[model samples]
Target chain A: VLLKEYRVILPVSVDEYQVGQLYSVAEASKNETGGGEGVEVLVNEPYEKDDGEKGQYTHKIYHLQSKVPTFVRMLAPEGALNIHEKAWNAYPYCRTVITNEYMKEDFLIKIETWHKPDLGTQENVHKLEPEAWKHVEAIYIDIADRSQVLSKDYKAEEDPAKFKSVKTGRGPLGPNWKQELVNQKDCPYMCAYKLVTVKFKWWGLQNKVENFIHKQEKRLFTNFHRQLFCWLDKWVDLTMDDIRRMEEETKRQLDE
Target chain B: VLLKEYRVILPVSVDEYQVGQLYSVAEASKNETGGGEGVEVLVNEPYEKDDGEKGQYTHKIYHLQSKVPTFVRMLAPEGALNIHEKAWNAYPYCRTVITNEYMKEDFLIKIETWHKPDLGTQENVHKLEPEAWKHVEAIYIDIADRSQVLSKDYKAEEDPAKFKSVKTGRGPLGPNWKQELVNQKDCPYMCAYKLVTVKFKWWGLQNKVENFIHKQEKRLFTNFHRQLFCWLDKWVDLTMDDIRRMEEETKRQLDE
Candidate 1:
C-alpha cells in the first residue's frame, strides 16, 4: 500500500469548518450528480461503534460511467464504474473507505482525517508505527501556499488567490498569508490532517496506480478546500439544523 | 521501510557470473582498503539454514570513517562509523543484511538477490505480497543500456562502450545491444534481480534518509556491476576454488 499524510490548513476555526465542510459537500454533490451519471446516496444516518465512538455514517456511490475515459469504459463491465464511499464522520476524527463496485476484492482507498484547531503543527497525528512512518509521507498543503502545482482544470473563480468571502470577510488571502498568521498571537486556523492509503493488487500496475491515486487525492483535497472556503458566504449563515435539512434535500437531489 | 527491486541484466552466463561475482568483490576491496580505514573481515565460514539450505557465509564491517561526510562525524561519537554486513551466499539466492554499528537499533538494509538466466523479464522474482507490491518499485538496470543517468564519477575506461574483454572475448557493447540480444535466440544472458529494502527510524528524517540511501545504493549497484563486467578479463579464467583462495588472501589483507 502507498500511504501519504497531507496537512491542509484553512483560515477558519474547527467549529466553523464543521458546518462549512458539511454544507460544502452537499452543495458540491449537486454539481457532481447530474446527467444520469453521478453520485447516488445510499445511506445517511447515525452510526455507533464498539469502541464507544458514535457518529454519522454516510455511504454514497459515485456513478462515474460517463466521466471515465472511453478506454477504461471499454475495458470493464457496465456496473464497474460505481465507486462506493463509506465514511464515519466522528467529530475531530473520521474514517472514510472507498472501494470499487466491481473488482472490490483487491482495491481499497482509506482516508483518515483529524480536524485540529491549530496552524498545522501537530506531529504524528495518526500515530503510525516507525516502520510504517517511513512509508507514509507527511506533507503540508497551505491553502495560501502555491508551492504545489494546480490542476489543469483550475478555475479562476475557484482560485484562492483572488477569492474573498463577502459574508464572513475571510478570504482574498495574500501570498504571504501563512507568514502573517504566524506573526499574529491569536489567529483563527484549522488543520484538516488527512492520511490517505491506497492499495491495488496487480502485477505491473500496482505501484504506478497507487502513485497516480495519491496525485489525484492531493488535487481533490486542494480543490475541495478552496471551494469550501470560497463558498463560505452561502454556508456561513446556516445553522446545524439548516445543514441537516439541506443534507436530506441533497439526498433527494442525488436520487433524481 | 522503503523498498526498490532492481533488475540488472548482464551479457554473461549465470554459471560464469557465479565465479565472477565472488572474484570481483574480493579484488575491489583492495582499492577500498588502506591507511587504517577499509573493510574488516570477521567471519568466513559455511552457514546452514533451518530451511534445509546451506551456503558459505561472509561477515565484514565497512570501516566508513573517512568516507562519511565531516558533518555526520561531528554529529555522532566515535565507534559509530562501522557498517556491519552479514551475508549467506546461497548461490542464485543470496541474503545480505547491513546495519549500523553504534545505533543499529532501528537501522537495517536488506539485499536479496535472485539470479535468473534471462533478459530482465522474470516477473515476481521475490513473490512479494500483494499489498507490499504496491510499495516496492521494480526497475531495470540494463548493463549494456544507458537509459538511466550515470554517476558523475563515471570513468571512460570503466564505460561498457569503450571496453572489451581480452580473455572472454565479450564487450565493447553498443547502446542498442539489448535490442540485438532480443533479436538473437541463443545469446548468453543473466539477470541479477535484486530487491533492496531500507528502513531507518527517525522523527523527521526517516523517509528522506531512506530515499537518499536508495540513491546511493543504485549508484553502488551500477558502479559495482559495471566494474564486474569491465574486469571480466581478470576473473573470467578463475575457478570457484581460485575465488575461494583469493577471498582468504583478501581476508588476511583486510586484517593487516
Candidate 2:
C-alpha cells in the first residue's frame, strides 16, 4: 500500500513502442536480473490517451471490493519481489501510464499506486454513476483474479478444458517443467538509482472513471518496468562486444 | 456492509444433532423453495461450545480473503440452488459465526457485511501487532485470483494436478455428472419465508487478527451457505413419501 516512485535511464532510445514489445524484451532478458527470471506482462487492448493524442496505449486497472485469497506457496522464496507481490495483492497495484511519448532526453515514465478513501463501503460499494457502473462489473471480475493465476499451471490458457480434457499434451496441469537454474542471490538493494525521468501519475484524479484508467496504466507500467531493466546491463554488454569485433574487421580490411 | 439478523422456527429440535444430518435435511428440501435447488453445506471440525454446554452444534465461519471463482454456467439451471450461488459470488455473503446456540423456539442466523474505514490503508495495511506481520503474504495472493477460478473446471479440488494427472475415474475435471431431475420453473418471488429459528451473533468484532478471521469467515460462510439449502425440499419430500408408504403397509397387514 505504500506508494513509491522510480525512474531509470535507458542506454538506448525506445521512442515509440507498444507494451507488447516490452514483454518480448522481458523474455529476451530472462537471465538478465541475475538469479531471478524475467517478469511476465499481460497487456489489455489499446486505448486512446487523452483525446487519442498519444495514439493508443494499453492500460488496465483493478480494485478489490473485498480482498481475495492468497495461497501459501506464492511466498516461500521470499525477497524484494515477493514483498512487492504481497503489497500488489493486498491493495491495487494501480499502474497508470501518464506519458507514453518521449519528453526531453528520455521517455516520461510514471508509477502510481491509486486509492480512494470512499470505496469498499456498503452504500458506496456499487457507487458508479451511470456511464461508469456499467463497466464496473467487468473490471470488478478483473481485480478479483489478478494474482491467483500466477500459481496456476494453466493460467495462460483461456479454456482449461482444452488442456484438462485430454492426456495428449504434457500433463493435466500442463507440461512437465524442466529443471532450470535460478539466481539465489539477493537483488542488489539500491534505494536511490539514477533515472532519466520520474513523475507521479499514480495518484490524484477527480473523475471516477479516470481513476480506473489510471489504475490500469499503473499495472501496464509495473509489467513494463519489471522487464525493462531485467536484461538491460547484459544486453548492453553483448552489443558492445559486437561493436568491438566489427571495428577490428574494418581496421584489417583498410590495412590490406 | 449492511448487517441484518433473523430467527427461524425449528421443524425439529436440533439440540442433539450432527452437521452431516443437516446436510441430509438440506438435500431433502431441494424443491421446497420452488424452482431453485437447495444449498450444500461443508461442515468443518466441531468445536466444544464454551465447556461443551451448548451441546454438539454445527457452527462454522469463513473469510474470502482469497475469493474462489464461481463459474456462470453453475447458475444456468435455475432452482433454489443456482440462485444461491449467484448471490454468493456476486456479493460478500460473508457470514461469520459469532454465536451458535439458540434460545426459546428460534435458531438465530445473522448476516454481516463487515468493512473497516481504518482498513485498506497503508499504515494499518501490514499491521500485525504480534511483533510481526504474520499474515500479509497469505492474504495478498487471495486478492490475486478470486473470479478466474470460476472458469476453471476443477476449482474445488485442492490439488488440481492430482485431479488432472490421471483420467481414470473421470475427466480431469472429474467424473461425469449423472442424470437428475431439476425444477425448471420461475421462483414465485416472495417477501418472506418461514424458518424454524434464527438469531444474531454473526458480526461485531475489532482486532487486526479478527479482521483476518473475519475475512476467512466470510469465505467459509459463502461456501457453507451456498450448498446448505441447495437440494433440501426435494430430498425431504421423498423422505415424507417413504414414511407414508410404510404406515399404510403396517395397517394393511394388521387387517389381513
Candidate 3:
C-alpha cells in the first residue's frame, strides 16, 4: 500500500557490467563478511521452460551475524516481472527487485507486494507487518540532458505523439518547506527506464516475531544490500577483462 | 489435513534433558555434517508475554548441498496441538517445535490445520500439494511386554460400560505370510507417548522443488535429527555435573 523509491548510481559504464557477472559477484559476496557466515546460497540452478526459454535461478538466504540472526530469502526473477530483464536494463548493476519467500505458518509463499486494501476482500489479503518484504517497483538513473538535442531537432509538440513527458516532485525548497513539480525535458543522453507494474501482495505482524522483524529485518535489508553494493561497486569498477579473469579464477576454485 | 509419524528413541533417560540444553545442542549441531553448510538457524530468541508466559523461538533455513537446495520452515506451536508443551513433556529433551516465521506472500501466517472440505469453502483453503509438509499426527513408543501384569490385575475390562480397547491394523501372513491380527495389551517398564492430535499444515510443491523435497527433505529431516539425537544422547549420558560443565563451556562460546 505504500510507495518508496531508491536511487543508486551504477558507477560503471554499461559495457563493464553484465547480469551474469552480477550473479557471480553476489555468489562470491555471500562469504565476504563474518568469515563465510553472512549469506547462505540455498538454490542456484539453470532451468528451461516448456517453451524453450532458459533462465538461471537463485535463492540466497542471509543469516545476519550481528543482530538476532534472522534468515531472509531473496529470489531472482521474483514475482510477475521479468526480473532478469529489468535488472539488466534499468539498473544493469543492482540487485533484482526480487521476491522474498516466507512461510504462512509452515507453508511457504512468495510475495511480490505488501498489504494493499483495494486489491480485494479476500481473507488471504494481509496487512504489512514488521519484517515483511516489498517488491521493488522500479529503478531510476539519469544519463544526460536531452533538451539540447530536443530543441535543435524539433519543437516539443512537433515530435511524434508518443513523445510523452513525466514529472518528479521537487523538494523542500527552503526553511519554509515549500516544494513544486518539475517537467523532464531532454533527448541527448540515452536513459533507460526499466519498469514493471505487476504488483505482488505482501503480508505482515509481531510480539517477539514483530520485535525481531521491526528491529532486525530492516537492518538485515541494509546489511545485505550494503555488502552487496560494496562488493558490487568494487567489482563494477573493474574493466570487462578484469571481471572475466576474476570470474575464471573464482570458477576454478568453485569447481574444486 | 494428513497424518504421518516419526519414532525416535531417546537414548538417555528423561531426567538428563532440559529444553534450554537441547536448543543449545541443536544450535551447536548446525555445522556438524556439511562444513557449516547444511542447516542454517535463522532466529533464536526468548520472549515473555504480557501474561508472563515464557517460550523460546527459532527459525532454521536448510540448504542441502546436493541437489537444488530448497528452503523449508518448521515451527513450534505451529499447528493443532501445543508443540512446545508436547515436545517438552514427551522428551523433556530434544529441540522444541519452534515456529519458523514466514510471510504469507512474504509475510508469516501462523497455521493450525489444513483443508477439510466439510468445514466450508474459503479462499485460504488449500489442497495438499505434491511435496509440501504434513504435520506429525502422533508419536508412539513401546516398552517391554506386560501381558503377565495385565492378566494378573485387570481382567480384560469385565464391565460393559468400560470395556474399551484399540488395535492397529494387522495383515498378510501369506506366502510365507498368512494373514493375522495382532493385539498389544500391556503396562510395563516406564513408557511415554507424546501423542499430539493437532497437526500443523506444511507447504507442498513440484518439478525441481518436488524432486528435492522427495529425495532430500526426508534425508534432511533424518540427518538433522540423527545429529541432534547423536549429540543429545551423548550429552545426556554424561553425569549431571558433566552436563553442567559442558553447558557452561558451550554458553561461553555462544556469546562470542
Candidate 4:
C-alpha cells in the first residue's frame, strides 16, 4: 500500500468552485519554469506569515494530474459571514461577502488549489499551496434556460420564493455562494470575476441588470446585458479599433 | 512595503498542535526535511474511511520558510467536512496559529484561492494553488498566553459581578477548545517521538465553612494523578512495573 499526503487549508471566505473539481480544471502546463503540464492545482487555507501577523484564511485544495485520487485538506476558520448574500452581489467588486442564505446557514469552505512539487516525494506527492493574485476573477454564466431569470420576462416580487432564496437571486449554488465572494482587496478568485458569460442574441446581461439587482452584488448576480456589454466593448475595442486601426495605419504607410 | 510569497502544503486536522503549534514549532528547524524535523505529520481524526476513502479526514502540514507574508492554500473536494476550531488551538505552539477562539460570528474575510492554469501571468496564478503550514520548532515567547485556562487553579465561575453581561460561557474567547481538537490527528512538523501532552485541570473557590469547593473539586476530584497513571498504564502500557521500566529507559537514554 502506498501512502500519499496532500496539504489542506480552510477558507474564511465563500467562493463558488467545489472542492473536488481541481482534477478536471487543471492541466499540466508546458510554460512552467519546471516541466509538467500546468502545475497541478489545489486549494486550501490558513496561511502563515512572519510579519507579526497571519495571512489570508481560506479553503485549501490539491491540483494533480496523476492517476491517484488527489486529496488536499486544511484547517478552516470557524463561522460564515452574515452578509454572504451581499458579498455574492458584490463579489465582482466588493470585499467581505456574507454566508447566510435561505437554504443553508452559511458556507465555510472556499476555493483552494494543488499541484505536484517540481521535485516530488511520495509523502508530499500532491503538495501545493494557495495562490495570491492582484484580482481574483470569476466567470458568471447563465445557461439559456437559466438566463430567463435576467430576461425581460423577469420580475422580482412576482416570485416571492425567488427573492426569498439567495440561490434565485444569485442564480444557483444558494448560500454557499454568498459565503464565497468577499476578499476583493487581497485575492479575488472566480468569486470576484463572475466570469462566465452566455450569448443569446450576443446581448450583454450586465448592462441590463441595473433594475434587477443592486450595484453591490457582483459575484453571482448576472447583469445579462451589462456583462455582454463589458465583453463586447473589450472585444470590439481590441478587434475593431486597435487591430483594424493598426492594419489601416500600415496600409496608409504603404500608400505614402 | 515589500511583498514576498511563501507556499507549502499541510494536512487538515483539529486542535492544539495541528493548527496552533505548527508555526512556532517549525521555526527552529525551518530548513530541515529528513530525520522527521519539518516533515510529514498527521492530524488523526474521529472517523474511519472505507477502502476507496482517505480515512476520517485530517490535515498534513508542510513547512516552507519565506521572506515575507504570503498565502498558504490547497485544493479540496466539494463538501469536504471542514473543521475550523482545530486550526485555532495551535496558536500557543507557533509564532502564529489561526484560532477559532474569539472569532466573530461571521467569517472575518473571504480568502480567495482558486484552481486555474499555471500560465505564469499574474492573471493565472490561481491555477497553481499551494498549501500552508507554519513551522513550530521555533518558540514565540511573547505570544499571548492560553496556559492560564490550563492551570490547575484557574476558575471560570469566580466572578459574577466582574462579568457585567450575561455569562455566555465564552470567557472573552468562548469555549473554543473542543471544536479545534475534534479536527486534528497529530502534529505535522514535529518529531513523532516528541511527547505532546495536555493537562486538563479545573478549579473552584474554597468555601470557608467546610472548604466544600476544595473538598469536592480539588481534593476529592484530583484526577490529574489518576490521569497520569491511566496514560502510562492503559495508554502506553498497563501496570506500575511497566511504567517504571519505561521511565527508567527514557531517563537512561536522556542521560546518554
Candidate 5:
C-alpha cells in the first residue's frame, strides 16, 4: 500500500557548501516563529536576517554565475515522487531528500535525509557525515495548523498548536510515524524552521528573491556571507528524499 | 618593531548586495597571465562551460564584494609561527588595493579550496575534510622563491627542482630549520603547513572561477563542471625585504 501511493520526501546533499545553505534555510526564522513562519511570504530584496544576509552584489553574482552555493527541497506524494525525483536526479551536484506528504495528515512531515552509496564506515556512525544525511527533524508548516512560529511570539489560546493523531484523530490523512523529526535538538538541523518559521517554504523562497539580488551586487564582501549561509541551505536539502531514493535504489540492486 | 605596524586585523561587513548584480572575474589561461582565451568574467552574469553545450545557466551565483578570505602565519629568524588571524579582520569588505607595475600581482589573493576550516575541534576532525581539498594542496607564490611557482611546472633542465633550499624552508621568510612542504604532513591541524604561509601581499589568486550563468543553465542538466579551478585575486605590492620584515614581525607576535 505504501509503495503504491505517493510518498512525501526531504532532500540532502554531501557538498559542504550546499549543506551550509540548506541549514540556513532551516534556521531562517528560528526566533520569530518557534518552527518558523508559515510558507507564502514576500520580502524586500535588501533586507537582512540575523542568521543570514544577502544584498544586491551577492544576488547579482549568484543570478549570473553558477558559484553561489544552493540547495533546494520540496514535498511530494508517492504519485508525484517520480516528477520530484526527475527534477532532483537531473541536478548535477551530489544530493538527497525525503517526503511525508503521502503519510497520514495528523503526523509530522515524514522527512528523510539520504546518504551517499559508499559512505558506510564505523567512524561516521556517531557523527553526522557531511557526505551523507539522515532525517534529523521535521519542518511543520502552519497550513491547517495555527501554531506560532515561536512559543512566546503567539498566544496559545488564540494561535493554538495543532497536534497530530498517530493512532486516531480529526486531522486529514496523516499518521506520519517518522520519529526523527519529533526530537527538538536534532530536528533543527534538517527542518526549515531552523531558519525562520514554518513559513520558510516556496513562497518564502520567492519572497527573498529581491534580498538575494541585493546580496549579489556587493559580492566581494557579501560572497562569503551569502556563500556560507546558502551552503547551509544546500547541506540540508541534499540529504533529503532525492538522495535517499538513489540510496534505496542502489541498496536494492546490491541486495539482488 | 612588529608592534609598530598594525598588530591585529579582521574582516567586518564588506559590501551591500541588498541590490546588485552577480559577477565573476577569472584568468582563463593555464599560465597566470590574465589574457589568452581567458574565460569571460561577469559580475553576476551567466554563461556556459560544459563539454559541447555552448549555452547554459549556472546553479550557483557569484559576486566581487569584499575583503579576501585571509590565512595567517608568520616567520622569524628561528622559524615561523601561527598568529591565528583571519583575512576578514585585517581588511573588511570594499577596501581598495593599490599595486605597483602588476595589477593582479599587487593584491591579497586567496587560493583556497572548499574545505572545512580545521579550527582544531574534535567534532570537525574527520577523514573526508582532506579529500575535499586535494587540488589546493600546493598553492602559494613566493617572491623570495620564484621557483616555488615555476620550477615544478616548467622543470628547468638547469635545475629541475630549483630552490631546493626554499623547498625545505618554512614561514614568511623561509624555514628556520630544513623542512619541505611535503615532509611537514605529520604536523597537527594547528600548523598543517610547517612554514605557516598565510600572508598580506598583492597578487592574483590562481584557481578556478565558475560562471553564474553557466552554473544554473548547466545545473539543470550537468552540475558544476570544473571549467577552471576557482581562486581569488587581490593584488598587493611590497619588496621581498618588506615581506621578510613583516614575517619577522609576525614571528614576534607569535612568540607573545
Candidate 6:
C-alpha cells in the first residue's frame, strides 16, 4: 500500500486547462484506439454530485496488454489484464478510481486532484484534515526536467525544452525553469495537486505492484502534460462547446 | 514503507522461551562473530522501565557487509552498510528499534513482540488501544512448513522435521504436525506476536528496499527459530544464571 501526493506546475492558468486537457485527452484517446488492445469508453455524461456540482463523469476500460512487459502478460490472469477507470471531473476538484477485475478487495488506485492557482507551494489543497495527510508523501514533479525522461518514451517534438507554444508563447522551459518560475513571480501559473493512493495487498507483491503503478502513472502525467502544452497552438483556441462536441465524438468512436 | 504483524507458533511454553531464546541468541551471535564484519554487543544490562517492570536492555551494532546482495553492497552508502539495534525485553513484552546511520529520520525498523501462552490467535496483545492497528497487516509465519525455505539458507541439521530434542523429548514435527497439535489439546504451546514496521524514504527505491527487508526478516525469523528448536537438546537444561554468564563471555569475545 502507498500514498503519494504529486504536484505538477503548469505555465497556464486553471481556467485555460479546462479546454487544453480535454482536447489533449480526447486526441490521445483517439490515437490509442483502432486496436483491440486499447481504451474503451462506456459512459460519458453530466453527473450531479452530493455537493450539487454537475461534473463530467466517465467510465472506461483499458485493455493495454501490449503496453506491459511480456513477463507480466504471461503471468497475469485473465481478470488482471484489463483496467476499469471511473472518473469525475468537476474542474478544480476531480477524482478518479482505477481498479481491476482481479483482487478487487485487495487492489485499488484512487486519485484525488485539485487544480489551484499557485506555483506548487500550497499546503493540503484537498483540505483532507479529517482524513489526515500524515501518510501522504509529497513529490514535486518537474516535468520540465529532461533527465527524468526515459529514452524509449522520448520524442524531440514532445521535449519541453524544445516545445514553443505559438498561441500562449510559453515554451522551452529551460533546465533552470524552476529557478525562473521562482524569480518570475508575476507569471501565469497553476499547480495540479494529485493525491494518489494505491493498495495491492498480496504477500510479497504488494510493494512491488504499488511502486510500479506509482512510477508509471507519474511518467504518464509527465508525457501527457508535456504534450498538452506543446499542442497549445491547437487547443488554445478551443472553447467549452468545442470540448463538449469532442467528448461526444470520442465516445461514439470508442463505442464503434 | 511496510507494516506487518507476524505470529510465529512454538511447540514450547512462554516460560521456557525466556531462557531458550536468550541462550540461542548468544550462541548465534558467537557463531557469526570472530570476523571483522559481524555483531558487536555494546550494552547488556538490567534496566527499569516507565511501567516499573525490570527488563533486560541491550544495544548492538551489526557490520555484515557481505550479508546483502552484491548489487546492494556496492550501491549502499557507508552509513547504510551497518545496523544499530536497541532492544528492551520484559517478557512477555519486547521492543526492538533497528536503524542505520544513513537517512536516520526517514528510515526506521521497529518491532514490537508479545509472548503469549495461547496459539497465535490472540488479537491486540500489544494493547495498542490508543494506537489503531488498522494498517498493520497480519502475516502468519509457519516455521514448521519446509516449503518456505530457500536453498541457500536450508541445512538438514536445522530442519524441524528431521531433528528431535533428545532432552525435552520434543521431536521431529512431521508434515501433519499442525493438525496433530490441533487434535492433541493441553499441549505446551506459545506464540510470538511480532508487529514489524519498516520505512525507507528515498524515492524510486522506497518500496523495493522496504519489501526486501520485510521478506528477509521473515526468512531470518524462520531460520533462527528452527535452529532454536533443533538445538534445543543443548539449551533445554541451561539456567538463567548460565545464560547470564554466557552473555558476559560473548560480549567479551565480541569486543576482542
Worst 10 residues of 6 chain A by lDDT: A66-75
| Each prediction's DockQ against the real complex | 0.01, 0.03, 0.02, 0.01, 0.01, 0.01
True contacts kept of each: 0.00, 0.06, 0.00, 0.00, 0.00, 0.00
Best by DockQ: 2
Candidate 3 residue-wise lDDT, B1-256, digit = tens: 2223333232223353343234434464443323223345656677555755456655655432211111111111122111111121212312233333331122121222221212122222223343543443333221111221224223222211122223211111122111111122221111122221212243442234433322232232233333333343234345656655765675566542
Q: What lDDT score is found at residue A164 in candidate 2? A: 31
> Model 5: per-residue lDDT, tens digit, A95-161?
1222223332311111112323121222222234553324222223322232213333233222212
Candidate 4 residue-wise lDDT, A136-213, digit = tens: 232233221234343453544332213222221222223343244343233222222221111112124433332122
Each prediction's whole-model lDDT (CA): 0.74, 0.26, 0.30, 0.24, 0.23, 0.75
Model 5 per-residue lDDT at A131? 39
List where candidate 6 sits over 4 angstroms from the true fold: A1-256, B33-54, B62-78, B129-131, B182-187, B252-255
Q: In candidate 4, what are the lDDT values of residues B184-218, reduced to their tens digit?
A: 34312111111111111222311231222212222
Query: How well is each residue in B70-126 modelled by candidate 6, as lDDT tens digits?
Result: 212333445765668899988788988978777677988888899988788887777
What tier of docking accuracy does candidate 3 attain? incorrect
Tell me the spans in candidate 3 whose CA falls farther than 4 Å from its real position: A1-12, A19-237, A248-256, B1-12, B16-97, B100-192, B195-237, B247-256
lDDT per residue (tens digit) for residues B1-256 in model 5: 0000011100101121101101112222112211111112223233433433222232211121111011000001111110111111111111111111222332221211111223212221222255443422232222223233323223232221222222222122243212333244422111111111122232232221112211222221111111110111111122335544744664455431
**Poorest stretch of ten by lDDT in candidate 5 chain A:** A1-10
Candidate 2: regions farther than 4 A off: A1-6, A10-54, A57-228, A231-256, B1-5, B10-50, B54-230, B233-256
RMSD of 6: 18.7
- Give the interface RMSD of candidate 6: 21.1
Model 1 per-residue lDDT at B131 = 87
- Candidate numbers sorted by TM-score from highest down: 1, 6, 3, 2, 5, 4
